[PDB]
Amino acid sequence: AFMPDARAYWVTSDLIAWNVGELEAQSVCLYASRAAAMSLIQGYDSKVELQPESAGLPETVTQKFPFISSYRAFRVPSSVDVASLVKCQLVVASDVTGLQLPGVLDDMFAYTGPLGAVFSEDSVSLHLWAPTAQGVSVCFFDGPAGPALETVQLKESNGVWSVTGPREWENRYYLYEVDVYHPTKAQVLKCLAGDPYARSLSANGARTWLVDINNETLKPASWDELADEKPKLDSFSDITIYELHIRDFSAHDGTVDSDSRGGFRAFAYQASAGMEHLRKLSDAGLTHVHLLPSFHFAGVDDIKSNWKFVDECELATFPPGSDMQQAAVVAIQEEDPYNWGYNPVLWGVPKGSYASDPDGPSRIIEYRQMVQALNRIGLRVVMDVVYNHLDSSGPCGISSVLDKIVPGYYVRRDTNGQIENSAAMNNTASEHFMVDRLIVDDLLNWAVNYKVDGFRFDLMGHIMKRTMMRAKSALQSLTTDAHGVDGSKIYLYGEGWDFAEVARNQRGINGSQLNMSGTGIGSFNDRIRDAINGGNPFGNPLQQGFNTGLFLEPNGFYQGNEADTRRSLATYADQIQIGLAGNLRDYVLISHTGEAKKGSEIHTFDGLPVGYTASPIETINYVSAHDNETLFDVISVKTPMILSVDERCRINHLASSMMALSQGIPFFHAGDEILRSKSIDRDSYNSGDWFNKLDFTYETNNWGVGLPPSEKNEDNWPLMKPRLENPSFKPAKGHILAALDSFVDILKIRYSSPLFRLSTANDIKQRVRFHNTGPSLVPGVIVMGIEDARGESPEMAQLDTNFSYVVTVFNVCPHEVSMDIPALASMGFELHPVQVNSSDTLVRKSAYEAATGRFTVPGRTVSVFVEPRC
Numbered sequence: 001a002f003m004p005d006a007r008a009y010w011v012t013s014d015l016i017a018w019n020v021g022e023l024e025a026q027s028v029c030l031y032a033s034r035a036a037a038m039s040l041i042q043g044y045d046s047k048v049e050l051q052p053e054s055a056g057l058p059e060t061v062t063q064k065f066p067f068i069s070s071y072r073a074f075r076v077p078s079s080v081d082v083a084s085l086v087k088c089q090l091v092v093a094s095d096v097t098g099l100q101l102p103g104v105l106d107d108m109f110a111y112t113g114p115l116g117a118v119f120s121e122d123s124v125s126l127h128l129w130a131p132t133a134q135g136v137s138v139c140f141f142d143g144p145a146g147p148a149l150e151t152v153q154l155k156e157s158n159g160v161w162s163v164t165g166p167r168e169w170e171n172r173y174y175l176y177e178v179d180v181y182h183p184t185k186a187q188v189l190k191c192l193a194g195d196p197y198a199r200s201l202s203a204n205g206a207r208t209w210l211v212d213i214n215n216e217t218l219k220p221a222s223w224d225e226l227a228d229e230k231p232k233l234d235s236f237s238d239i240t241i242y243e244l245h246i247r248d249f250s251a252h253d254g255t256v257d258s259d260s261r262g263g264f265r266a267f268a269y270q271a272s273a274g275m276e277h278l279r280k281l282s283d284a285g286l287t288h289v290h291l292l293p294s295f296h297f298a299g300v301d302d303i304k305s306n307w308k309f310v311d312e313c314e315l316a317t318f319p320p321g322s323d324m325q326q327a328a329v330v331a332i333q334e335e336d337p338y339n340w341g342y343n344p345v346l347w348g349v350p351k352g353s354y355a356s357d358p359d360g361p362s363r364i365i366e367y368r369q370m371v372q373a374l375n376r377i378g379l380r381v382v383m384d385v386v387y388n389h390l391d392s393s394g395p396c397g398i399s400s401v402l403d404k405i406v407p408g409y410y411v412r413r414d415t416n417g418q419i420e421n422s423a424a425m426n427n428t429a430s431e432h433f434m435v436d437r438l439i440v441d442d443l444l445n446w447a448v449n450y451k452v453d454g455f456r457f458d459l460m461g462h463i464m465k466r467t468m469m470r471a472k473s474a475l476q477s478l479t480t481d482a483h484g485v486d487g488s489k490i491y492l493y494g495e496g497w498d499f500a501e502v503a504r505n506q507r508g509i510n511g512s513q514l515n516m517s518g519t520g521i522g523s524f525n526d527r528i529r530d531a532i533n534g535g536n537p538f539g540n541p542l543q544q545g546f547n548t549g550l551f552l553e554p555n556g557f558y559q560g561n562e563a564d565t566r567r568s569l570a571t572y573a574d575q576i577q578i579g580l581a582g583n584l585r586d587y588v589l590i591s592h593t594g595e596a597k598k599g600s601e602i603h604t605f606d607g608l609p610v611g612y613t614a615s616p617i618e619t620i621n622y623v624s625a626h627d628n629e630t631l632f633d634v635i636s637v638k639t640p641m642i643l644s645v646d647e648r649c650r651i652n653h654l655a656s657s658m659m660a661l662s663q664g665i666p667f668f669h670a671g672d673e674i675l676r677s678k679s680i681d682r683d684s685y686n687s688g689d690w691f692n693k694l695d696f697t698y699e700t701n702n703w704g705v706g707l708p709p710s711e712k713n714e715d716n717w718p719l720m721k722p723r724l725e726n727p728s729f730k731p732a733k734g735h736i737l738a739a740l741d742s743f744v745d746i747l748k749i750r751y752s753s754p755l756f757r758l759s760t761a762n763d764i765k766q767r768v769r770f771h772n773t774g775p776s777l778v779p780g781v782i783v784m785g786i787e788d789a790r791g792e793s794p795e796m797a798q799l800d801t802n803f804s805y806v807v808t809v810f811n812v813c814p815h816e817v818s819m820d821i822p823a824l825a826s827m828g829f830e831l832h833p834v835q836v837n838s839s840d841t842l843v844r845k846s847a848y849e850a851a852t853g854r855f856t857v858p859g860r861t862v863s864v865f866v867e868p869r870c
C-alpha cells in the first residue's frame with residue numbers, strides 16, 4: 001500500500017541525515033502517524049519542518065556511521081517529543097522516505113541496567129529493551145504446551161519495559177507480546193517473541209522458561225569445584241585445537257547407548273570409543289576441543305519424533321560413485337537430525353535437539369556435564385559463536401526473535417533500508433550499542449554459567465573490533481573467587497575475513513585479519529592453508545600446492561611451464577615458512593629470489609601481507625576445517641591419480657605435522673588424524689550423518705559413499721566420480737590406525753620442547769631460522785631450526801632443559817634428500833626419541849652426519865632432530 005523505503009537516518013536526538021541536494025534541502029519536513037495511517041503526505045498526526053544544518057554531521061556521528069559521512073544534516077526542533085515519535089510510523093519528505101533509527105535509539109536509550117529475568121528472595125522481575133514499542137505484555141503458561149494462564153502488562157522507563165511479580169513465577173514459561181511498527185509491512189503489528197536474554201526454552205524455542213540459572217538442581221555433582229579440576233594452561237602459546245561437531249562425534253558410535261547418541265550426553269560415556277579417542281589425543285598433548293554451534297539454532301527440530309532417517313543398509317548397496325545416496329539424503333535433509341548450526345535464533349541457550357528432553361532442565365545440566373567430562377580428560381572447551389547474523393528477521397515465524405522486538409536495529413541495513421545479507425543472510429549490526437551489549441553479555445553467560453574455556457568467532461570480520469576488544473577485557477577479568485572461572489585463561493580467535501559492506505572499515509573498524517593485528521585475538525591463517533594444499537577452496541580444484549605435488553609430481557592439469565611451476569612452488573614455500581614462524585609482519589625470511597623480506601613484504605595475490613600478526617598467539621595455523629574439503633579429500637583430488645593410498649597417507653601426515661610443529665596455535669579438523677572423508681563434499685552443513693560420518697571403530701573413513709549433494713558439488717562431480725569409484729583410493733583400517741599413531745607422535749614431539757611454542761615475536765625472530773632458501777633451493781624441502789641457550793655467556797634465556805637445539809626437515813619429495821647445512825655441522829644432533837621408536841619404519845632411517853651438517857631424510861617424511869643437553 002504505502003510502503004516507503006528508508007534512505008534517511010535519525011542519528012541523534014536532534015539530527016537527521018539524508019542525501020538530498022541543496023535546493024531539495026530547503027523544504028524538508030518530518031511526518032508521524034501512531035496508527036501508521038499515512039498516504040502519498042496525508043493522514044499524519046503531526047508534521048514539523050526540519051531546518052538544514054549547514055555544519056553537517058558531527059564527528060561522533062561520522063565516526064560511528066562512516067558510510068553516511070557525506071549526507072546532509074537536518075536539525076530536529078526542541079519542540080519534538082522524540083521518545084513518542086520513534087514509536088510511530090515516520091517519513092521525511094522533500095521525494096518521501098522512511099528513517100533508519102538506530103543512531104537516535106542509542107543516543108537516547110542506550111541502557112546498562114538489568115535485562116532478562118532477575119530473581120530475588122521474594123520476587124521475579126522481567127526487563128526488555130524495546131524503545132520503539134507502543135506496548136509490551138507478557139503471557140504466562142504453566143508448562144511447554146498449556147494455554148496461557150494470565151497476561152501481565154509491562155511498564156516502560158527509558159526504553160525498557162519491566163514488571164515485577166512473586167517468586168512463584170519461577171519455572172513458568174512465557175512469551176512477550178510486543179506491539180511495534182514493522183517497516184517491512186508498514187504496519188504496527190503484535191508480535192509474540194521470546195526473551196533475547198533467555199537462559200532456557202521449550203522445544204524449538206517456542207516459549208521461554210523462567211528458570212533461575214543459579215539453581216542448585218541445575219548443577220552436576222562437583223560443578224562449583226570445576227575451576228580447581230580444569231586442565232592447567234600455562235600460556236596461550238601451549239594451545240592446540242581440535243574442531244568437532246557434537247552430532248558427528250557420537251551419531252555412529254555403537255559404544256554409546258542408542259538413545260544417547262548425537263547430543264551432549266554422549267560425552268558422559270567415559271569408556272566409549274569416542275571418548276577413548278579424545279583421551280588418546282589429550283594424553284598426547286591436545287589442549288582444546290572447539291565444538292560447532294551449540295546454542296539455540298534453527299534447522300533441526302528439537303522434537304525427535306519428527307526426525308527422518310535414510311535406510312543406511314540400502315544406501316550401502318549403491319555404487320561408490322552413484323548419485324543415488326545424495327538424492328536420498330537430500331530428500332529428507334530438512335527433516336533429519338543434522339545441521340552444523342550456523343543459524344542463530346537465541347545465543348544464550350543450549351540447543352534442545354542435543355538434549356535428552358528439550359523441555360525443562362536437561363539442556364542446561366547436560367551441557368554442563370559435557371564441559372565437565374571434557375575437562376576431566378584434560379581438554380578445555382571452545383564454543384563456536386555466531387554473532388554476525390540471524391537465522392530470520394521480520395515480524396512472523398518461530399525463528400525470528402530479535403527483529404520481532406526492535407525491528408531494523410539488531411540487523412545491519414543498506415542505504416535503502418534493506419537488510420544486509422553478506423554473512424549468510426540477516427547480518428547483525430554489532431556497531432549498535434545494545435547489539436554489542438548482547439554479544440558481550442552472551443559471552444559472559446557462557447563463561448560463567450557454563451565454565452566455557454574459549455570462543456571461536458564465526459565471521460569475526462563482520463563484528464566491530466571495539467566489540468571484540470570490550471568482550472576480551474570483560475572475559476579475561478573474570479576470577480575464580482568472584483565468578484568461579486579463571487578468565488585470564490579464556491582464549492579468543494575467529495575468521496577475520498574482510499568483504500562486502502564491512503570492507504574498507506565502511507561500518508567502523510571491523511574484526512579483520514589486518515585490524516586484529518596486535519590484539520592478541522587469533523585469526524585463521526588462510527595463507528599457509530592455501531600454500532600447502534594449493535589454490536584456494538573457490539579456485540580450480542586441481543590447482544596444486546607445496547604438499548599436493550606442484551612441480552614435483554604434476555597431476556596433468558596445466559599450470560604453466562616447468563620454470564614457472566618450480567618458482568610457484570618456491571613462492572608457496574616462502575608463504576609456508578612465514579606461517580611456520582607465527583605468520584608475523586616483522587619476521588625476516590630469505591625469499592625464493594634471494595632477497596630478504598619481512599613477512600608483511602611477502603604478498604598475497606591481492607597485494608596484502610602474507611605475515612600480518614604482531615604475536616604468534618594471533619595465528620591459527622590450519623590446513624583443514626569443517627568448511628570446504630577434508631584434508632584427506634583435498635589431497636585425493638589434487639595429487640596425481642596414480643599415487644597409492646599409502647603415499648597419500650604420508651602426505652596427510654606431512655600436512656598435519658606442518659601444523660603441529662608450527663609457531664603459533666595449531667588447529668586440526670576432527671578426522672585429520674584418521675583420514676576422514678566426506679566423499680569430497682565441499683560444504684557438508686546439511687549433508688546428514690551419511691556424508692559426515694566419524695567412525696571411531698576405524699574400519700572406514702567414509703570415502704566412496706556416493707557423489708556428494710548436488711546443490712554445492714554437482715559442477716565437480718566429473719572429477720569426483722572416477723576417484724570415488726577407484727578401489728585404490730580407499731584406505732583400510734591399517735592405514736587409518738597408522739595415520740592416528742603418527743598424529744599422536746607428532747603431538748608428543750610438539751609438547752616435548754618449549755622451542756616449538758615460543759611466546760613472543762622477539763623469541764621467534766631470535767631463534768627460528770630456515771635453511772633451504774633462495775633461487776637455488778632444493779625444491780620440496782623446508783628445513784627449520786630453533787635455537788636455545790648454549791655454551792657459556794649465552795645471549796638468550798634457556799627455555800629447554802632437555803634440548804639445546806631442534807631441527808625439523810619437511811620433505812614432500814617422493815625420494816630421499818640429503819640437506820647439507822654447514823651452520824649445523826659439528827653438533828650433537830640425533831633423531832628425536834619419539835621417532836627412533838616410531839611404528840613408521842621409514843622415519844627411523846633419518847640420519848645426521850656431523851662433519852658436513854648433513855641431514856638425510858626419506859621421501860614424504862617429516863624428521864625431527866634434537867641436540868640433547870644430558
Ligand SMILES: OC[C@H]1O[C@H](O)[C@H](O)[C@@H](O)[C@@H]1O
Pocket residue numbers: 536538605606
Ligand atoms: O571467495 C573468497 C576468496 O576471494 C578471493 O579469491 C580471495 O583471494 C580469497 O582470499 C578469498 O577467500
Ligand SMILES: [Ca+2]
Pocket residue numbers: 299333334335336337338339686687688
Ligand atoms: Ca538437515
Ligand SMILES: [Cl-]
Pocket residue numbers: 319321322323
Ligand atoms: Cl554408478
